Design a protein around this ligand. Structure first.
Ligand SMILES: CCCC(=O)OC[C@H](COP(=O)(O)O[C@H]1[C@H](O)[C@@H](O)[C@H](OP(=O)(O)O)[C@@H](OP(=O)(O)O)[C@H]1O)OC(=O)CCC
Length: 743
């Protein structure tokens, strides 16, 4: 029931050992692909499970694992729907239960045999790395269509036996599926993986409710274990909690079983609000949605703070407990000692957290909007509602213990879409490009200052390297603090108002929860009118702030175009001087990372400035580049990177794929310095491909397990806008559709 309370490095190290195998009858969920997708018990949490895939290859070095097989997905669909139907007919008012269930089985048993019998095992599989119009993939599509039709009949029939509509059946799958989410792991040798080492990627589930959330779901306050795995589509009736949210970790396992961790951030969450509830909603119900997204933002704050704690070793924690409050001796028990160490760590240490949310929805889209504009506006309103302030979080210290604290919160948010509508021709009615023009402008300002203020900080110090200092001089951009100042005065003026606004909004939601029968109308109108007052007020002030930001944007652009050519030369010179030092084995481990961090931090900014100021980020061949570079940056500055789309299954995942690939590709070079190669390479899908292509090929495996975990079936169905950006050819998106089908 508990979320991780141990040190992350330690938890990962255990997750990669020998674990206890789990029998099929005991899995929480059907993953298919026996012998590929193996299932074990979590080495620490009792009742928790883990899925692990190892890459395996054919004679040509092409991956055999992580390929769609129609039979297997069909199995998953059946199995995963059967569970849903059972659950549903278990909890309903009607009788006949066992007769209903026993029938569903009979039907499932026969549908499997029908499939295995009509679908040639050899034609059942796809190659992701060839072309979809090849004879083999064309045979695969043929079987898929056939199979789709049967799962249609299968479900039509399960609806009828169970006595439940499809809509309910889907709804319930999302309910039960989001309870015991398994850890998902993929191991494989990256290109150039040293002798007897392996790389790995894992998604660790991480939702825990906040106290407020707990009280409101009407459950018991004094519970330390507040688990949930809310799925991509569990957003129906003012539900609380974040959806589709995982800790994402990538590293290498050394020959002695220890672990270097190269990447550590969040996959998710999807939409922070229960988007379903917009459907013909009045202004009263919209405001409630707003409150909810606020209530989930405070859970995000809690989650980032748990993550900081667990990125800290027991020495780390001890080093931050001032000498005079350290206990005489630690407790004998590994666990109860860490518990005490976190408690004391927290008690005596102001904590704060920085979220960098790289959103990937297209906020301005005008058709099948799917309320994407709110998903932008509302989340940005609320990350900002909390920016520069404190939230009462709880930190879980042991399996039975927690503590309370304020955590400070700083927010950074971008929104650059990634789909066909991401940028649209002038006058094109299909989408409003400028819905996010202001925010992104702002974001780019904040993130540059952050780096600047970070450079000046370590710039002064390491000066036995002089191309560093000149680079520094240039990145400084233009003198702009005249305007920055005004910005930070006005941001400060905003803080008190935001706080009242939050309390008012929490308050409002508290009444609205009761319902029309129990609402007190007078109180409700009071509460609403309070909020909008504050809102109107903030909005006005926020408007003024952007103007000053756009004034800066005008200025920084001007600067870039002039200095682009200089800067990249001066970037290149810094490479030239730094690298040699880096490979050299006498240089200590500490100085080296300060070089790496300085250089990469700079490389990311410049390469983002290019795409942003020249407005090229949207060109097909650059599709995910600006977002990935910004997120990679936020990881350099040690921020927590949250990223995603609406349900974080399709767009949110390919972004993650790029962020991790680049992370690994960079961490395994002779040097550790980002070279853009992983982003820039044009994947050819040939039979002989480059090393980055060979690595890109590995990355869709974890996406598919993630997808199964949310939906019951493999996938991700992002419509690729330029084939050169990816090693795979989309084919899991066909199976991805199984979840979709409805009568
Ligand atoms: C060919 C079908 C035409 C259509 O329906 O129009 C909208 C959609 C825009 O595509 P998108 O924004 O890449 O797709 C959405 C997609 O439209 C939407 O279905 C997805 O939500 P859901 O399926 O998980 O509920 C959402 O999932 P993520 O939130 O990114 O995981 C995306 O896959 O597709 C297009 O390509 C239109 C271009 C002409």
């Amino acid at each position: 029931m508990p979320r991780i309370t141990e040190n992350i490095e330690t938890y990962v190290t255990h997750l990669l050992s020998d674990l206890e195998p789990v029998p099929s009858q005991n899995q929480h969920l059907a993953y298919g692909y026996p012998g590929e997708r193996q299932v074990f018990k979590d080495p620490m949490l009792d009742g928790k499970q883990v899925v692990v895939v190892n890459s395996q290859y054919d004679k040509h070095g092409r991956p055999v694992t992580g390929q769609p097989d129609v039979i297997q997905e069909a199995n998953n669909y059946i199995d995963n729907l059967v569970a849903a139907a059972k659950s549903l007919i278990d909890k309903d008012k009607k009788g006949e239960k066992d007769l209903r269930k026993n029938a569903i089985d009979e039907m499932a048993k026969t549908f499997k045999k029908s499939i295995s019998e009509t679908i040639p095992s050899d034609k059942a599989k796809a190659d992701l790395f060839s072309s979809k119009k090849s004879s083999a993939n064309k045979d695969f599509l043929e079987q898929l269509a056939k199979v789709e039709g049967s799962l249609q009949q299968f479900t039509q029939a399960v609806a009828k036996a169970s006595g439940h509509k499809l809509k309910a059946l889907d709804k319930e799958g999302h309910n039960i599926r989001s309870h015991n989410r398994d850890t998902l792991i993929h191991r494989f040798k990256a290109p150039n993986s040293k002798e007897g080492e392996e790389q790995f990627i894992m998604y660790i589930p991480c939702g825990r409710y906040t106290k407020r959330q707990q009280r409101l779901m009407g459950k018991d306050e004094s519970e330390v274990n507040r688990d949930h795995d809310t799925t991509s589509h569990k957003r129906s009736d003012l539900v609380l909690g974040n959806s589709s949210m995982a800790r994402m970790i990538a590293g290498t396992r050394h020959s002695d079983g220890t672990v270097t961790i190269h990447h550590d951030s969040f996959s998710g969450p999807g939409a922070r609000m229960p988007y379903s509830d917009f459907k013909g909603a009045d202004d009263y119900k919209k405001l409630a949605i707003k409150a909810v997204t606020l209530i989930n933002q405070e859970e995000v704050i809690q989650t980032l703070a748990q993550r900081q704690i667990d990125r800290m070793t027991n020495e780390d924690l001890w080093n931050k407990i001032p000498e005079e409050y350290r206990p005489d001796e630690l407790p004998p028990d590994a666990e109860k000692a860490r518990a005490q160490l976190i408690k004391l760590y927290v008690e005596h240490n102001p904590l704060s957290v920085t979220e960098c949310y790289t959103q990937v929805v297209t906020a301005g889209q005008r058709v099948a909007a799917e309320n994407q504009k709110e998903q932008f506006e509302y989340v940005r309103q609320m990350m900002d509602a909390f920016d520069g302030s404190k939230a009462k979080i709880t930190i879980q210290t042991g399996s039975n213990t927690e503590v309370e604290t304020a955590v400070g919160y700083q927010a950074r948010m971008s929104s650059w879409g990634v789909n066909w509508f991401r940028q649209v021709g002038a006058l094109n009615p299909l989408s409003d490009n400028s819905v996010t023009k202001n925010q992104n402008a702002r974001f780019v300002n904040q993130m540059t200052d952050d780096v600047i203020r970070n450079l000046d900080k370590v710039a002064q110090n390491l000066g036995d390297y002089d191309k560093a200092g000149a680079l520094h001089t240039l990145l400084k951009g233009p003198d702009v603090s005249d305007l920055n100042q005004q910005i930070t005065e006005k941001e400060n003026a905003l803080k008190e108002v935001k706080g009242a606004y939050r309390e008012a909004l929490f308050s409002y939601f508290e009444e609205y929860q009761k319902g029309e029968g129990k609402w007190d109308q007078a109180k409700l109108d009071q509460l609403k009118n309070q909020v909008d007052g504050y809102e109107k007020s903030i909005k006005k002030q926020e408007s003024a702030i952007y103007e000053l930001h756009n004034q800066i944007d005008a200025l920084r652009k001007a600067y870039y175009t002039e200095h682009k050519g200089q800067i990249n030369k001066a970037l290149q010179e810094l490479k030239e001087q730094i690298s040699p030092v880096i490979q050299n084995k006498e240089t200590d481990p500490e100085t080296k990372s300060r070089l790496q961090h300085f250089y990469n931090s700079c490389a990311y900014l410049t390469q983002a400035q290019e795409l942003y100021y020249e407005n090229t980020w949207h060109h097909g061949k650059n599709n995910f580049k600006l977002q990935t570079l910004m997120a990679s940056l936020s990881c350099e500055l040690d921020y927590a990177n949250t990223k995603g789309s609406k349900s974080n299954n399709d767009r949110g995942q390919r972004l993650a794929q790029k962020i991790v690939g680049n992370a690994l590709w960079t961490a395994m070079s002779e040097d550790g310095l980002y070279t853009g190669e992983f982003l820039d390479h044009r994947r050819t899908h040939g039979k002989e491909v480059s090393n980055v292509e060979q690595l890109d090929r590995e990355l869709t495996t974890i996406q598919a397990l993630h997808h199964t975990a949310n939906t019951g079936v493999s996938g991700g169905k992002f419509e690729i806008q330029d084939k050169a950006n990816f090693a795979d050819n989309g084919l899991f998106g066909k199976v991805a559709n199984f979840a979709k089908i409805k009568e």
